[PDB]
Amino acid sequence: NEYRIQKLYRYICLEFKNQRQLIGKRQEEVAFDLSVTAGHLSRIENGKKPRIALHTFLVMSEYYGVDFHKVVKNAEEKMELDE
C-alpha cells in the first residue's frame, strides 16, 4: 500500500524528468521559465521532495503541454515495466 504510494510518486516525478529530457531542455532553462531554482526543479524531478503540492505538478503539466492524467498513466506504465 504505502510502497505503491511512494513508488508511484517517484515515478510521477521521474515522468516529469523524462518530459524535460525528451524535449532536450536543461534544468536551468525550465527552472527559469517556471520561476524556480534549478536545484528546486532537480529535487522535484528526482523524487527527493515527498510533499510537493498537486498544484506544482499541474503547473508542470501545463508547461509541458501534456495532460496530467497522461503523466500519471505513463508513470504507472513505467513502474510496471521496471516492476
Q: Is 4 in the site for Cl ion (CB under 5 A)?
A: no
Q: Is 46 in the site for Na ion (CB under 5 A)?
A: no
Q: Could you say which of Cl ion, Na ion, a second copy, none residue 54 binds, taking C-beta under 5 to 8 angstroms by partner kind?
A: a second copy
Spatial CA neighbour of 29 closest among 63, 62, 71, 55:
63
Binding window for a second copy (CB under 8 A); candidates: 14-22, 24-32, 60-68: 60-68
Spatial CA neighbour of 59 closest among 37, 38, 27, 31:
31
Q: Is 39 in the site for Cl ion (CB under 5 A)?
A: no
Q: Could you say which of Cl ion, a second copy, Na ion, none residue 24 binds, taking C-beta under 5 to 8 angstroms by partner kind?
A: none
Backbone region of residue 50 per phi and psi (left: phi > 0; alpha: psi in -120 to 50; beta: other values): alpha
